[PDB]
Design a protein around this nucleic acid. Structure first.
Ligand SMILES: [Zn+2]
Ligand SMILES: [Zn+2]
Ligand SMILES: [Zn+2]
Lengths: 151, 94, 128, 50, 150, 93, 81, 97
RNA sequence: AAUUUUCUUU
RNA sequence: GGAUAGUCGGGGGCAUUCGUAUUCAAUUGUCAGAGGUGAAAUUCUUGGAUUUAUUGAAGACGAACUACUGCGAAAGCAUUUGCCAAGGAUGUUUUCAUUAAUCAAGAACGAAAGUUAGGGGAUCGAAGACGAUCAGAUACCGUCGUAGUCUUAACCAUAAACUAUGCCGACUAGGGAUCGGGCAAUGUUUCUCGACUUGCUCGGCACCUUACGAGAAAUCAAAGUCUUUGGGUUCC
């Protein structure tokens, strides 16, 4: 989602306002006989920007499992949530919105979460389901000129 | 580890000073390492005790809880305002 | 790149179907036609024929402006209700496709609840 | 009043600048800062009567 | 058949048939007895005495080498606590529950557990008074339970 | 001896003014004539004087507190204090 | 079936049963003497130890207690007897 | 007599279970007693694929679907014929046909 | 949607 | 009974965090119907209804994941985190040594609804108001709607409170799933552990077949070991 902020030569300029996942994709991802772990954390950039980012991940089979349950204990769920919290904080300690967008498209948050969850249930389909924006800067009236003006 | 257990085992094997007048005497004599100040302490008295400990190079801990809680932690049935641990014994209070 | 993209909301309720078409933004909409102004029987508002009549009337009024492609978004009653699109949703989709207007980015945006408030009926429910 | 966050609980509020307290002066009563409006600065408040 | 629960667990320790000192050991009996005395002065319960001796020092069962139970050894050498270990642990648990309840009065589950612990303590105290381990006027009061523990 | 089944402090009112009114007054006066703890001295010596003023005696902490009509602190004031504390933290941070 | 020798059950049929459920209940644990990798003293330890074991000489932790058999991480050439 | 061994719902090791609302009549039916079906329907009918393709963009994009969980009561399920009355011998089977 | 009633016996 | 080690739990309480949905409020865009129903009808809408878009507030609840799965003595317990007390099973060559089972009298908890005071009242909704159906509808249907639905401090104390099946203990047939723990694998896999696979065992939730056996039968691994009638103990 984008928020239109500035007008330049009868050509409006927008800014990043958040990301989400389609209902069809979310319903397809949600499945029975598996454990879903969803967590959230609030992050801050170098400038004034409060972003509440969510993440959701599902348990996965090992291509040799015979049973059909594939469930994880609540202690392992809490350990997974801690691993997601640590990964989010480490990867978002100092990024700013430019790096946030540059790192959400290649899906590095989900990859790092899955890598960190090697010692726990392997987990799968880890992705940021929704990012919400709570605070905004002073319209960035001059930083928009700094970023734009090319082509 | 927590500090209530550490305070209890210093009580079993250690040297403690109760109250304000005796705490001032211990700080004045210099045989003081740690002072514990309750959250219900008078602000003027707390500033005076902090100044005394800064002069005598003694550590200060203004732990949470009222003087009733400090006395209960100390194992006494009366209110304790200022604690002065002179000998830690076999603990790591200091 | 001589195409203009709008946003076509479809509200497929079991009593009446809404065919709302706006610009790429949300405000400053252009066309809003339902089955009530296409059939006057007070019974076939949600009928597929009435839905397709409203959909094709919306297509004609949009072609009047000159907009070519629409991002479609169908949605049911949602909330604490049936949450299933009515029969007019597919009829409106086919009517827009047949009218010649381009269709893109099909999505369902029905409002789902996270265990919202109590539904009416009174425990025993609507004993019709 | 304009320098307080929305939803704060206050008392002895002035109807005008320099009034020195007019609203919410009785015992147990208070005024709630409902919202602010910077353009021609004005603050909307909720009185004890509602 | 748990006394205050529906569990039917059978977890326990199965002592060996050979009621003899270990074939390969050099406990020397008296050395272990003084070792238990040293640990008793250190202030650990007889259960901790056996656990530490079995896990670390390598004596499976102390009575096999010593000839008497460790509680008997402690009583014989004078380091016999006035309150039995099981009763002391039960009263300490009751004190902790009571402190939790007095700080948080809404814990009905804790109140129910306190009732169970109180009943268990009274039954154990009655047994100990009957056998003679405690004075016949022992009694149990919640007000002085904290002083009893400490 | 119990000396009173249920009226308690309202036994001075005899049989008049109604049972419900006497019960409401009984609850209010029980709250009113109660010793409270000074939040700065830790002593149960706070007593009410003139409907909103609470004072505790002693050599120290002779403070006079502005409280409720018959309780030192009211639920509404505590909720307001928490709300103001929350708002102040958000503004500061 | 319907005719068995309960006096002398098979060893394989006994090692697969619970310790209590055996004909004569017995322990399933043992003691082993381990040697410090950088010393010469030998210390006996229990297979189901519930406490942190420290060698007599200058050495670090020996094994970590767990629900079942504790894991040895020091390079000790243990002899079990 | 007990018509069903499970009393009509999956309640073993429980004392109380939350109740859900029927889609049709909005009756309060327990979670373990509600008949659950999963409608997985393409967002358009199979007869409009050609029309959508001839009027679409994005170079053969994937057509989404909708996933709806339907929880019927006993009376509504029987009326809707999703679940049917069976013989006494056939009542003891749970594998879908 | 909507559908109430079938005297005492042979 | 107690202690100890790794665990496990939608067990309890306190503080804290997040989610959409519902209703309402303000603002912006075109216009004629919108709700609802078998059909309708009440009601409100060129004064802008409904819809769409932005922001905010209130209260309630934790969808999907969610299962012939878990926990608790039961009633019941389902968002994140932290704290506190406690609990079952498992492992144990740890501790005490009969401390045990069932109970009159007496006590703790006890869904929902109902009561007394304080706060809050979004949704639903007893009473009620209208509008349709019917011969009469006083009801079932639509909208609105008070108490109530939330919570604190005091009350009571019952439900098809059910497994219509008291508690403890011994024995009894074949198999396969599932939860928690433990044991074993010169087993597999992923940058020393986890996940998966196999076998054994303990304690639970259950399931299929069968009837040595029981019942009047429906049916029951207990409701079997009862005319071959007696392990112990309460309620009725
Ligand atoms: Zn004072
Ligand atoms: Zn060592
Ligand atoms: Zn239904």
């Amino acid at each position: 989602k984008l928020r239109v902020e500035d007008i330049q030569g009868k050509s409006c300029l927008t800014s990043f306002n958040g990301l989400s996942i389609t209902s069809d994709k979310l319903r397809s991802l949600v499945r029975k006989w598996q454990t879903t772990i969803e967590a959230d954390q609030t992050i801050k950039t170098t400038d004034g920007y409060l972003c509440r980012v969510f993440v959701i991940g599902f348990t996965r089979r090992r291509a040799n499992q015979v049973k059909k349950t594939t469930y994880a204990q609540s202690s392992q769920i809490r350990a997974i949530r801690q691993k997601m919290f640590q990964v989010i904080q480490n990867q978002t300690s100092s990024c700013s919105m430019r790096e946030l967008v540059q790192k959400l498209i290649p899906e590095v948050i989900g990859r790092e979460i899955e890598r960190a969850t090697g010692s726990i249930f392997p987990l799968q389909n880890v992705l940021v389901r929704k990012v919400k924006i709570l605070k905004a800067p002073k319209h960035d009236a001059q930083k928009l000129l700094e970023l734009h003006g090319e082509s | 580890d927590t500090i209530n257990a550490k305070l209890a085992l210093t009580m079993k094997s250690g040297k403690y000073v109760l109250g304000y007048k005796s705490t001032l005497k211990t700080l004045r004599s210099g045989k003081a390492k740690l002072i514990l100040i309750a959250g219900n302490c008078p602000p003027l008295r707390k500033s005076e005790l902090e100044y005394y400990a800064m002069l005598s190079k003694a550590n200060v801990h203004h732990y949470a809880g009222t003087n009733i809680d400090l006395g209960t932690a100390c194992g006494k049935l009366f209110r304790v305002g200022v604690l002065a641990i002179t000998d830690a014994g076999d603990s790591d209070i200091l | 790149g001589e195409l203009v993209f709008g946003v076509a909301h479809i509200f497929a309720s079991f009593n009446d179907t809404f065919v709302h078409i706006t610009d790429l933004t949300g405000k400053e909409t252009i066309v809003r036609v339902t089955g009530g102004m296409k059939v006057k029987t007070d019974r076939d508002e949600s009928s597929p024929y009435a839905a397709m009549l409203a959909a094709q009337d919306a297509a004609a009024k949009c072609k009047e402006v000159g907009i070519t492609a629409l991002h479609i978004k169908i949605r049911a009653t949602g909330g604490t209700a049936t949450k299933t699109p009515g029969p007019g949703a597919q009829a409106a989709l086919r009517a827009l496709a047949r009218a010649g207007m381009r269709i893109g980015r099909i999505e369902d945006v029905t409002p789902i609840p996270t265990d919202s408030t109590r539904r009416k009926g009174g425990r025993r429910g609507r004993r019709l | 009043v304009g320098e307080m966050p929305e939803g704060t609980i206050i008392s002895n509020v002035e109807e005008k600048a320099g009034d020195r307290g007019a609203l919410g002066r009785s015992s147990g009563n208070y005024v709630i800062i409902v919202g602010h409006d910077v353009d021609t600065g004005k603050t909307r408040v909720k009185l004890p009567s509602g | 058949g748990r006394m205050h629960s529906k569990g039917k667990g059978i977890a326990s320790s199965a002592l060996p048939y050979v009621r003899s000192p270990p074939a390969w050991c050099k406990a020397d009996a008296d050395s272990v007895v003084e070792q238990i005395l040293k640990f008793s002065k250190k202030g650990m319960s007889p259960s901790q005495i056996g656990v530490t001796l079995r896990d670390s020092h390598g004596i499976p069962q102390v009575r096999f080498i010593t000839g008497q139970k460790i509680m008997r050894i402690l009583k014989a050498n004078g380091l016999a606590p006035e309150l039995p270990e099981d009763l002391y642990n039960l009263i300490k648990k009751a004190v902790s529950v009571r402190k939790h309840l007095e700080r948080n009065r809404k814990d009905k589950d804790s109140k129910f557990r306190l009732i169970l612990i109180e009943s268990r303590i009274h039954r154990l105290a009655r047994y100990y008074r009957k056998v003679g381990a405690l004075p016949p006027t022992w009694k149990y009061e919640s007000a002085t339970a904290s002083a009893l523990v400490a | 001896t119990k000396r009173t089944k249920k009226v308690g402090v309202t036994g001075k009112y005899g049989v008049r003014y109604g049972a419900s009114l006497r019960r409401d007054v009984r609850k209010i006066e029980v709250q009113q004539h109660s010793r409270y703890q000074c939040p700065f001295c830790g002593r149960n010596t706070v007593k009410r004087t003139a409907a909103g003023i609470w004072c505790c005696n002693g050599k120290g902490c002779k403070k006079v507190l502005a409280g409720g009509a018959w309780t030192v602190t009211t639920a509404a004031a505590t909720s307001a204090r928490s709300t103001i504390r929350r708002l102040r933290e958000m503004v500061e941070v | 079936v319907l005719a068995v020798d309960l006096l002398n059950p098979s060893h394989e049929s006994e090692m697969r049963k619970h310790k209590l459920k055996q004909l004569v209940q017995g322990p399933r644990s043992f003691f082993m003497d381990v040697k410090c990798p950088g010393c010469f003293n030998i210390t006996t330890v229990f297979s189901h130890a519930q406490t942190v074991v420290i060698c007599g000489s200058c050495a670090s932790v020996l094994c970590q207690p767990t629900g079942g058999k504790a894991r040895l991480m020091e390079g000790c050439s243990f002899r079990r007897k | 007599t007990q018509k069903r061994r499970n009393n009509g719902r999956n309640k073993h090791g429980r004392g109380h279970v939350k109740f859900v609302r029927c889609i049709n009549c909005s009756r309060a039916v327990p979670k373990d007693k509600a008949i659950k079906r999963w409608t997985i329907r393409n967002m358009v009918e199979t007869a409009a694929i050609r029309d959508l393709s001839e009027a679409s963009v994005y170079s053969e994009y994937t057509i989404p679907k909708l996933y709806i969980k339907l929880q019927y009561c006993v009376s509504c399920a029987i009326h809707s014929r999703v679940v049917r009355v069976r013989s006494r011998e056939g009542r003891r089977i749970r594998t879908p046909p």
